[PDB]
């Protein structure tokens, strides 16, 4: 996030000498040398007043004495010398000391006491306008074409740090070098996006024709459920960008979902959660309607996510109205991640907000389990009923995606429009090429 860059800019605008030496430079094997270096740096700061002292990664020397060699004694002596020099600093001479850290939990509360670290500033990851401005700054160093729209890249890459935007533009430059491009095109920029987000494309590494039809069916069913819920009931859910079955990184297939604005990510209502949960079982709905009754293991993770969010609706948030006495923590924890389903609508899915207690009565636990089973089963019948009403669009999208190895959200929308509900499957089956897309983007 450029905290070191922030301090360097402060010194540059202030016109004062900048003293940079990281926290990892204070660790040694011999004892007492680090405190001597602290004293030397401090007195050299007191020579040219005003001046700024900056210590990068201050938590290296300021590790908390966690209660969960002689180097540790050196760390404590350096901490004692630093706190003595900080507390003995008269404020009239204007020597400001800066400390950059990555984790507040491991830093000792003694420094957080007023008189040593009076000001605590958080450096939030840049917003859409912030990432826009970082892209403007970093794009002035490399040759840029007029076809690159950096606003979409700033909006579609949430929470990315400034160094990550720097590596974005650098890998775009290296991709253009690889393609021998005279400038950064939009295709190369998107290539850098898919290289750093999901990973590089492999060469000819494909499984059998059955190992790809199931993943394609699952991802296309999830996309079709999301698009149908957007089309019919006007859900507060995301939109499909593109769906792929080309292996990238360690994902054999991927469906891309846009990230919405965080203002709608605070008051998650019951209908929004129900439609997102239907979107989660869209994969198993696809396996059950396309393969009839022989489902596979490709849609198990979505099933687990649906099962946990049903419990979160029931126990943690207590959205229904029989009142419950306790919530339960997730037995399994999967981190919020990339293109797969968002599962971060309330900040995250697998994070209870310390709303759990140990249960005493074991007779209400089964009623909670039965309520969760009833909700999951009813919701499963509704999503399978809605997806089974459109078998033509689902089958055509599966065939087109299997032929092209990648489909777009606009192509899925075109298939949905050109295939209305309740049309026979023979209309798709009489075509000269079911996996043919007559629409040109």
């Amino acid at each position: 996030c450029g905290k070191t860059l922030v301090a360097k800019a402060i010194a540059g605008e202030a016109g004062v000498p900048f003293y940079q030496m990281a926290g990892s430079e204070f660790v040694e094997v011999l004892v007492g040398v680090g405190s001597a270096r602290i004293r030397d740096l401090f007195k050299r700061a007191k020579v040219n007043k005003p001046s700024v002292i900056f210590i990068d990664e201050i938590d290296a020397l300021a590790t908390r004495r966690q209660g969960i060699n002689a180097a540790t004694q050196e760390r404590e002596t350096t901490l004692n010398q630093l706190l003595i020099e900080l507390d003995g600093f008269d404020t009239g001479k204007g020597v400001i000391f800066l400390g950059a850290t990555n984790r507040r939990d491991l830093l000792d509360p003694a420094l957080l006491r007023p008189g040593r670290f009076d000001r605590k500033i958080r450096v939030r990851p840049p917003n859409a306008k912030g990432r826009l401005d970082i892209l403007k700054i970093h794009a002035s160093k490399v040759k840029m074409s007029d076809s690159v729209d950096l606003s979409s890249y700033a909006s579609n890459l949430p929470g990315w740090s400034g160094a990550k935007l720097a590596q974005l533009v650098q890998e775009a430059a290296l991709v253009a070098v690889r393609k021998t491009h005279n400038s950064i095109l939009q295709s190369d920029m998107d290539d850098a996006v898919d290289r750093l987000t999901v990973g590089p494309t492999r060469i000819g590494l494909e499984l059998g024709h059955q190992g790809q039809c199931r993943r394609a069916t699952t991802e296309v069913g999830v996309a079709i459920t999301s698009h149908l819920l957007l089309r019919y009931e006007n859900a507060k859910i995301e939109r499909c960008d593109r769906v792929s079955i080309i292996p990238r990184g360690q994902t054999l297939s991927q469906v891309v979902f846009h990230r919405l604005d965080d203002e709608s990510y605070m008051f998650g209502r019951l209908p929004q959660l129900l439609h997102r949960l239907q979107v989660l079982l869209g994969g198993r709905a696809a396996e059950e309607v396309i393969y009839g009754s022989d489902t596979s293991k490709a849609s198990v993770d979505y099933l687990s996510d649906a099962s946990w969010l049903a419990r979160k609706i029931l126990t943690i948030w207590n959205l229904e109205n029989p009142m419950v006495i306790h919530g339960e923590p997730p037995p399994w924890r999967k981190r919020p991640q990339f293109v797969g389903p968002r599962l971060d609508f309330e900040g995250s899915l697998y994070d209870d907000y310390d709303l759990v207690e140990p249960p005493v009565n074991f007779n209400m636990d089964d009623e909670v389990a039965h309520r969760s089973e009833e909700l999951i089963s009813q919701m499963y019948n509704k999503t399978v009923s809605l997806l089974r009403q459109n078998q033509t669009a689902l089958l055509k999208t599966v065939k087109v995606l299997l032929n092209q190895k990648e489909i777009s959200g606009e192509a899925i929308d075109f298939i949905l429009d050109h295939y209305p509900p309740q049309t026979p499957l023979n209309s798709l089956l009489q075509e000269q090429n079911p996996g043919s897309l007559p629409f040109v983007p």
């Binding site: 004692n80 006491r113 209502r269 006495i325 309330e346 709303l355 207690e357």
Partner: protein, 478 residues
């Protein structure tokens, strides 16, 4: 080596002293009038130990008592004694006490004895043996053999339970003084002394600042002084007033106020949440005095908050009534009550999920805290049926608080709409205008009688019944 120079801190430099200051000057008396002390036959108590919350300035008290005593002052960190090598710490303590005895009369100060005063046999390592050796050496140099009658040790710890009872033995550490958190006057005088070095005004009232920042240590008051210097140059006024102090305290206890983009329905939701909390709180005795009401998001809390300052004596001692908790659970459930009564049952949100669990946790703590009436308290049983029934009463208690919250919030719809509109238009509300709106649109709140009226009616009933018994004995016998 361990000797410090320029110890000019006195008792005037330190505030929030109280009767402890008397003991402090008693120590000064021990350093001045000890001739008649030993003439009467009193051995001077060497061990005085200050125990209390951090940031109260125990080392500042040490400097004050050393300056008032007028003797040599030694201030040694206890962290230097523990080391990976053995024997060197014992020699350090030996040199410390030898140079203290040579510099007699003197006072020696060691802070945070919990690092080296840990009970032996709690950690299995060479550091534990070194700690045991240093503890033994300091014990011997304190009381072991004759040779000290003039050197007095002062110590500052935070947790008194960790200390070795061998150290707590009289003649080694017999005087134990607790430094409490400053009250109302103590915060006043600490703010005064920490603010004497800066130009202040004559219309500056510290009473409101002290009552605003309740339950805080003297270091926090020094911090309030430190946020009385940086934030007035944004507007550029002439002299410091109490408004800046109030805003600095508000910033410190919660966080800095940051403004972000927000829609109208989000503001309405936060407003109806805060309205639910305040409106259900004002009709209850323990949470009646709501002073602030804002929906502005702060650091760590995107919600608003309601500020109340109940009596803080019954809460600490434990004299809170059973009805005082059934009221608080209703208060925590009332955000969900407003959400259900306004957006319907099918459109419950997740903004009240932080209070809806506090209510159920409070109910669970109540039912097994002995406060129930199932048999008579009886928070523990043996058979599984009664153990299962233990958690039934908590859910019925939540249900009855839940219906009570529905009834309370349904009685007050007009004032609800009014306070929601005011909260959306102004984003903040103080006690006066909120209470004015309450008086304009409030419903009837018949207060249940306190314990005094119940005692009086029971006493008069008992007297009339006993005199009835007296006449039914007398005129039947006479």
């Amino acid at each position: 080596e361990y000797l410090e120079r320029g110890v000019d801190v006195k008792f005037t430099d330190v505030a929030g002293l109280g009767k402890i200051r008397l003991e402090l000057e008693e120590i000064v008396k021990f350093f001045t009038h000890g001739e008649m002390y030993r003439r009467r036959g009193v051995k001077i108590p060497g061990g005085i130990l200050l125990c209390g919350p951090p940031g109260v300035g125990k080392t500042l008290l040490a400097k004050a008592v050393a300056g008032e005593a007028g003797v040599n002052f030694f201030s040694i960190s206890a962290s230097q004694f523990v080391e990976i090598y053995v024997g060197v710490g014992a020699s350090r303590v030996r040199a410390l006490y030898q140079e203290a005895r040579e510099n007699a009369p003197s006072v020696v100060f060691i802070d945070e004895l919990d690092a080296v005063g840990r009970e032996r046999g709690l950690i299995k390592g060479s550091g534990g043996q070194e700690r045991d050796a240093t503890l033994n050496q300091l014990l011997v140099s304190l009381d072991g053999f004759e040779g000290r009658g003039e050197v007095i040790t002062i110590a500052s710890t935070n947790r008194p339970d960790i200390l070795d009872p061998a150290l707590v033995r009289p003649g080694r550490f017999d005087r134990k003084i607790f430094i409490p958190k400053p009250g109302l006057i103590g915060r006043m005088e600490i703010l005064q002394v920490h603010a004497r070095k800066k130009p202040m005004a004559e219309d500056l009232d510290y009473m409101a600042v002290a009552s605003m920042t309740d339950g805080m240590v003297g270091a926090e008051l020094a911090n309030i002084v430190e946020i009385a210097a940086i934030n007035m140059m944004r507007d550029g006024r002439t002299e410091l007033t109490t408004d800046d102090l109030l805003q600095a305290a508000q910033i410190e206890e919660r966080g800095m106020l940051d403004r972000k983009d927000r829609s109208l329905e989000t503001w309405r939701q936060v407003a109806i949440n805060e309205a639910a909390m305040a409106v259900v709180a004002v009709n209850f005795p323990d949470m009646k005095n709501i002073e602030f009401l804002t929906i502005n998001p702060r650091a760590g809390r995107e919600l608003g908050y309601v500020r109340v300052k109940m009596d803080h004596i019954k809460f600490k001692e434990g004299m809170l009534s059973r009805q005082s908790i059934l009221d608080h659970i209703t208060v925590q459930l009332a955000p969900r009550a407003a959400d259900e009564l306004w957006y319907g049952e099918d459109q419950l949100s997740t903004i009240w999920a932080e209070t809806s669990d506090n209510a159920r946790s409070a109910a669970r703590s109540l039912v097994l805290g002995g406060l129930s009436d199932k048999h008579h308290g009886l928070n523990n049983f043996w058979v599984a049926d009664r153990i299962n029934d233990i958690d039934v009463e908590a859910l019925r208690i939540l249900n009855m608080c839940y219906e009570r919250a529905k009834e309370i919030l349904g009685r007050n719809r007009t004032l609800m709409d009014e306070v929601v509109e005011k909260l959306v238009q102004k984003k903040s509300l103080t006690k006066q205008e909120f209470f004015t709106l309450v008086e304009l649109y409030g419903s009837s709140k018949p207060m249940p009688p306190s314990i005094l009226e119940l005692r009086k009616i029971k006493r008069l009933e008992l007297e009339e019944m006993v005199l009835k018994l007296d006449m039914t004995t007398a005129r039947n016998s006479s």
